[PDB]
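Quick one: structure for this chain?
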Amino acid sequence: SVIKPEMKIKLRMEGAVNGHKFVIEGEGIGKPYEGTQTLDLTVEEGAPLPFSYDILTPAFNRAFTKYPEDIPDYFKQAFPEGYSWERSMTYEDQGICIATSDITMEGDCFFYEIRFDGTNFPPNGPVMQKKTLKWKSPTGKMYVEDGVLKGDVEMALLLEGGGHYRCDFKTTYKAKKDVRLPDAHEVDHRIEILSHDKDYNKVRLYEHAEARY
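Got it. Here's what it folds into:
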């Protein structure tokens, strides 16, 4: 396979949230067959970010998923050519984000070109007031609709003071070439900010992910 036991990551995200433009760059490494990865992220433009960093982190690659051999791996099959995704993230207080990522590969390194846009977050809401702690770890569903791979997951951010803040994720995936399509299945994720500086200009981000029926 062209996916090595260890793969590097390089990315660039450009976007805007409630009109505030930003650019974030990332460099990392992961073990695709183990489903693990770590990213170091740097706010290159638009610092300091006036919104919760947590809304960004699921945008920062399902190739880093442990797939059982009896479930076809859409994401590892898509390389070297790559794949893209389109995602809507609909929060319970009418804040909405939409994002896209084009994922390519050159040598032992993935490259992401990410666009992230968000709007209509309440000014005194948990996102613009930075009251989010971390994402819960729900199980997401993967399924195919007329030859296209889709994902749906009901997400939630834990809040300061003990509450939770929900978000509906819908993703569409597109391999550059035809690959074996999997039957419907699930993916477990855990995503965590391991470290950050005061205003999250620097962030170290970790994900573990595993597929199952």
